[PDB]
Each structure stands twice: as structure tokens, then as C-alpha cells.
Design an enzyme around this catalytic site. Structure first.
Site, PDB file in Angstrom:
ATOM      1  N   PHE A  55      39.408  40.045  16.364  1.00 26.74           N
ATOM      2  CA  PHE A  55      38.424  40.950  16.945  1.00 26.74           C
ATOM      3  C   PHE A  55      37.026  40.586  16.435  1.00 26.74           C
ATOM      4  O   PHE A  55      36.853  40.461  15.239  1.00 26.74           O
ATOM      5  CB  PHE A  55      38.796  42.377  16.510  1.00 26.74           C
ATOM      6  CG  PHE A  55      38.155  43.493  17.328  1.00 26.74           C
ATOM      7  CD1 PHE A  55      36.841  43.906  17.074  1.00 26.74           C
ATOM      8  CD2 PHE A  55      38.870  44.151  18.335  1.00 26.74           C
ATOM      9  CE1 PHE A  55      36.251  44.926  17.829  1.00 26.74           C
ATOM     10  CE2 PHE A  55      38.273  45.152  19.107  1.00 26.74           C
ATOM     11  CZ  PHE A  55      36.968  45.543  18.847  1.00 26.74           C
ATOM     12  N   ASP A  56      36.031  40.432  17.319  1.00 29.60           N
ATOM     13  CA  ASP A  56      34.685  40.013  16.949  1.00 29.60           C
ATOM     14  C   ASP A  56      33.662  40.884  17.673  1.00 29.60           C
ATOM     15  O   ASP A  56      33.823  41.151  18.864  1.00 29.60           O
ATOM     16  CB  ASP A  56      34.454  38.549  17.304  1.00 29.60           C
ATOM     17  CG  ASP A  56      33.017  38.026  17.223  1.00 29.60           C
ATOM     18  OD1 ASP A  56      32.301  38.358  16.276  1.00 29.60           O
ATOM     19  OD2 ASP A  56      32.623  37.241  18.104  1.00 29.60           O
ATOM     20  N   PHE A  97      36.740  40.778  26.759  1.00 33.43           N
ATOM     21  CA  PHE A  97      35.421  41.137  26.259  1.00 33.43           C
ATOM     22  C   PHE A  97      34.832  42.347  26.980  1.00 33.43           C
ATOM     23  O   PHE A  97      34.987  42.521  28.194  1.00 33.43           O
ATOM     24  CB  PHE A  97      34.409  40.026  26.494  1.00 33.43           C
ATOM     25  CG  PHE A  97      34.621  38.747  25.695  1.00 33.43           C
ATOM     26  CD1 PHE A  97      35.444  37.746  26.181  1.00 33.43           C
ATOM     27  CD2 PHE A  97      33.944  38.528  24.499  1.00 33.43           C
ATOM     28  CE1 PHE A  97      35.646  36.577  25.463  1.00 33.43           C
ATOM     29  CE2 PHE A  97      34.147  37.363  23.781  1.00 33.43           C
ATOM     30  CZ  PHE A  97      34.977  36.380  24.269  1.00 33.43           C
ATOM     31  N   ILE A 151      32.003  29.604  26.295  1.00 34.70           N
ATOM     32  CA  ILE A 151      33.115  29.350  27.193  1.00 34.70           C
ATOM     33  C   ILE A 151      32.715  29.612  28.657  1.00 34.70           C
ATOM     34  O   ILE A 151      31.819  30.413  28.936  1.00 34.70           O
ATOM     35  CB  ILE A 151      34.345  30.183  26.792  1.00 34.70           C
ATOM     36  CG1 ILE A 151      34.065  31.677  26.815  1.00 34.70           C
ATOM     37  CG2 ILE A 151      34.904  29.731  25.451  1.00 34.70           C
ATOM     38  CD1 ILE A 151      35.309  32.530  26.627  1.00 34.70           C
ATOM     39  N   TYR A 179      28.200  42.275  22.586  1.00 31.93           N
ATOM     40  CA  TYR A 179      29.588  42.111  23.010  1.00 31.93           C
ATOM     41  C   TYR A 179      30.556  42.531  21.901  1.00 31.93           C
ATOM     42  O   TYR A 179      30.229  42.491  20.713  1.00 31.93           O
ATOM     43  CB  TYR A 179      29.928  40.673  23.427  1.00 31.93           C
ATOM     44  CG  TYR A 179      30.060  39.688  22.265  1.00 31.93           C
ATOM     45  CD1 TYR A 179      28.942  39.046  21.729  1.00 31.93           C
ATOM     46  CD2 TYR A 179      31.290  39.425  21.686  1.00 31.93           C
ATOM     47  CE1 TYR A 179      29.052  38.193  20.633  1.00 31.93           C
ATOM     48  CE2 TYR A 179      31.412  38.569  20.594  1.00 31.93           C
ATOM     49  CZ  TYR A 179      30.291  37.937  20.075  1.00 31.93           C
ATOM     50  OH  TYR A 179      30.401  37.094  19.000  1.00 31.93           O
ATOM     51  N   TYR A 196      39.678  28.659  25.847  1.00 34.07           N
ATOM     52  CA  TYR A 196      39.936  27.591  24.892  1.00 34.07           C
ATOM     53  C   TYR A 196      41.147  26.727  25.276  1.00 34.07           C
ATOM     54  O   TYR A 196      41.546  25.868  24.520  1.00 34.07           O
ATOM     55  CB  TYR A 196      40.078  28.260  23.526  1.00 34.07           C
ATOM     56  CG  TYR A 196      38.756  28.866  23.073  1.00 34.07           C
ATOM     57  CD1 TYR A 196      37.698  28.075  22.677  1.00 34.07           C
ATOM     58  CD2 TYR A 196      38.551  30.245  23.119  1.00 34.07           C
ATOM     59  CE1 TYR A 196      36.479  28.634  22.336  1.00 34.07           C
ATOM     60  CE2 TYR A 196      37.344  30.816  22.776  1.00 34.07           C
ATOM     61  CZ  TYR A 196      36.311  30.007  22.347  1.00 34.07           C
ATOM     62  OH  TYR A 196      35.118  30.559  22.026  1.00 34.07           O
TER      63      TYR A 196
HETATM   64  C1  LIG Z   1      35.757  29.692  18.663  1.00 35.51           C
HETATM   65  O1  LIG Z   1      34.972  30.243  17.622  1.00 35.51           O
HETATM   66  C2  LIG Z   1      34.468  31.497  17.776  1.00 35.51           C
HETATM   67  C3  LIG Z   1      34.772  32.366  18.821  1.00 35.51           C
HETATM   68  C4  LIG Z   1      34.212  33.635  18.862  1.00 35.51           C
HETATM   69  C5  LIG Z   1      33.335  34.007  17.859  1.00 35.51           C
HETATM   70  C6  LIG Z   1      33.021  33.130  16.831  1.00 35.51           C
HETATM   71  C7  LIG Z   1      33.600  31.877  16.764  1.00 35.51           C
HETATM   72  O2  LIG Z   1      33.297  31.024  15.714  1.00 35.51           O
HETATM   73  C8  LIG Z   1      32.175  30.183  15.952  1.00 35.51           C
HETATM   74  O3  LIG Z   1      32.188  33.370  15.772  1.00 35.51           O
HETATM   75  C9  LIG Z   1      31.792  34.730  15.491  1.00 35.51           C
HETATM   76  C10 LIG Z   1      32.930  35.293  14.648  1.00 35.51           C
HETATM   77  C11 LIG Z   1      30.392  34.633  14.889  1.00 35.51           C
HETATM   78  C12 LIG Z   1      29.343  34.668  15.997  1.00 35.51           C
HETATM   79  N1  LIG Z   1      29.375  33.463  16.834  1.00 35.51           N
HETATM   80  C13 LIG Z   1      29.673  33.330  18.138  1.00 35.51           C
HETATM   81  C14 LIG Z   1      29.576  31.992  18.386  1.00 35.51           C
HETATM   82  N2  LIG Z   1      29.186  31.380  17.247  1.00 35.51           N
HETATM   83  N3  LIG Z   1      29.087  32.266  16.290  1.00 35.51           N
HETATM   84  C15 LIG Z   1      29.793  31.225  19.638  1.00 35.51           C
HETATM   85  C16 LIG Z   1      31.130  30.490  19.646  1.00 35.51           C
HETATM   86  C17 LIG Z   1      31.646  30.270  21.054  1.00 35.51           C
HETATM   87  O4  LIG Z   1      32.222  31.531  21.495  1.00 35.51           O
HETATM   88  C18 LIG Z   1      32.298  31.765  22.807  1.00 35.51           C
HETATM   89  O5  LIG Z   1      31.985  30.993  23.668  1.00 35.51           O
HETATM   90  C19 LIG Z   1      32.764  33.189  23.090  1.00 35.51           C
HETATM   91  C20 LIG Z   1      31.698  33.867  23.956  1.00 35.51           C
HETATM   92  C21 LIG Z   1      30.427  34.141  23.213  1.00 35.51           C
HETATM   93  C22 LIG Z   1      30.736  35.089  22.096  1.00 35.51           C
HETATM   94  C23 LIG Z   1      31.868  34.601  21.160  1.00 35.51           C
HETATM   95  N4  LIG Z   1      33.040  33.978  21.873  1.00 35.51           N
HETATM   96  C24 LIG Z   1      34.287  33.968  21.332  1.00 35.51           C
HETATM   97  O6  LIG Z   1      35.182  33.308  21.843  1.00 35.51           O
HETATM   98  C25 LIG Z   1      34.594  34.602  19.971  1.00 35.51           C
HETATM   99  C26 LIG Z   1      36.097  34.996  19.893  1.00 35.51           C
HETATM  100  C27 LIG Z   1      36.437  36.131  20.870  1.00 35.51           C
HETATM  101  C28 LIG Z   1      37.889  36.518  20.787  1.00 35.51           C
HETATM  102  C29 LIG Z   1      38.241  37.035  19.403  1.00 35.51           C
HETATM  103  C30 LIG Z   1      37.970  35.948  18.377  1.00 35.51           C
HETATM  104  C31 LIG Z   1      36.519  35.408  18.479  1.00 35.51           C
END
Ligand SMILES: COc1cc2cc(c1OC)O[C@@H](C)CCn1cc(nn1)CCCOC(=O)[C@@H]1CCCCN1C(=O)[C@H]2C1CCCCC1
Length: 128
Positions: free
Chosen positions: A55-56, A118, A75, A45, A101
């Protein structure tokens, strides 16, 4: 760009038909099977705030992002959206805060009432 195209032409995949999770298929997957709740799922992703300010990418880790579907490990929009995808599929999701969130957000990383975008590739899924 991509987010705007999903607003305009994306399918509403919420049970409530509240446009909280919108989807466009960008590349078709294989076979009919889509994952069941409990299945172990493997994805690549790229994600951002809709305005593009954080951006991730799983590519930044070189390795798939792995989670069990429908156990709220991610989420709600992912539990909903990935459950609709086939192996090999790439899809775009645009997501309102209620399926991400919410009004609390997840500061400092995610602000209150943030819309998310995404691109997701479904690599594989395997039974519990
Ligand atoms: C709210 O915190 C974060 C949100 C998102 C990513 C986060 C994160 O810090 C924990 O870390 C990345 C940078 C490291 C990989 N990773 C993913 C998760 N844990 N570690 C799972 C965390 C839960 O995330 C989600 O449910 C979603 C869907 C799965 C992939 C990541 N998700 C995110 O929301 C990213 C977020 C997307 C928008 C831009 C900023 C990061």
C-alpha cells in the site's frame, strides 16, 4: 470493495478494448480541459496490490506526486488514465499487469502478474 466495484461497473478506457485499464469517476472535476502529452501534472494518489499486500500513498510524503504525462515516467495505465481526467477529478483505476509491471513484475516490491488499484486526485496540470 472498491476494486470489485470497478471490475463490475468500470469503463474500459484502453484503445484495444482489452479491459486492461478500468475507470470509475468518484468526484467530477472542473472545466472541459484534460491534460495533453508532455504537460506537467500534479496528483494525490493511494495505491495497492489488488489483494492489498503492499500500500502506497503520496499523503505519506505530505506532497503532490508530479510527472510529465505520456513520457512513460509512470506505468502505461497512468499515462492512459490521468490523460482522461479533469482538474479536481477523483477517479478509481483497476489495472491488469500488462498496463503495469507485467509478468516480470518489480520485485521485491511488485510480484509477477500483479493487478493494481489506485485512487487518484488530479490537482493541476501545466504546459511544458
Ligand atoms: C515500482 O516501484 C514503485 C511503485 C510504486 C511506488 C514506489 C515505487 O518505488 C519507486 O515508490 C513509492 C513507495 C515512493 C514514491 N515514488 C513513486 C515513484 N517513485 N517514487 C514512481 C515509481 C513508478 O510507479 C508508478 O508508475 C506507479 C504510478 C505512479 C505512482 C506510484 N506507482 C506505483 O506503482 C507504486 C506501487 C503501487 C501499488 C502498491 C505498491 C507501490
Amino acid at each position: 470493495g472498491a476494486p470489485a466495484t470497478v471490475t463490475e461497473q468500470g469503463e474500459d478506457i484502453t484503445s484495444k478494448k482489452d479491459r486492461g485499464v478500468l475507470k470509475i469517476v468518484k468526484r467530477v472535476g472542473n472545466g472541459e480541459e484534460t491534460p495533453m502529452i508532455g504537460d506537467k501534472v500534479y496528483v494525490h494518489y493511494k495505491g495497492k496490490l489488488s489483494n492489498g499486500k503492499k500500500f502506497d500513498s503520496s499523503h505519506d510524503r505530505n506532497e503532490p506526486f508530479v510527472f510529465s504525462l505520456g513520457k512513460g515516467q509512470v506505468i502505461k495505465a497512468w499515462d492512459i488514465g490521468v490523460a482522461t481526467m479533469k482538474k479536481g477529478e477523483i477517479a478509481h483505476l483497476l489495472i491488469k499487469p500488462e498496463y503495469a509491471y507485467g509478468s516480470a513484475g518489480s520485485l521485491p516490491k511488485i510480484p509477477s502478474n500483479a493487478t493494481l488499484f489506485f485512487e487518484i486526485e488530479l490537482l493541476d496540470f501545466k504546459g511544458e
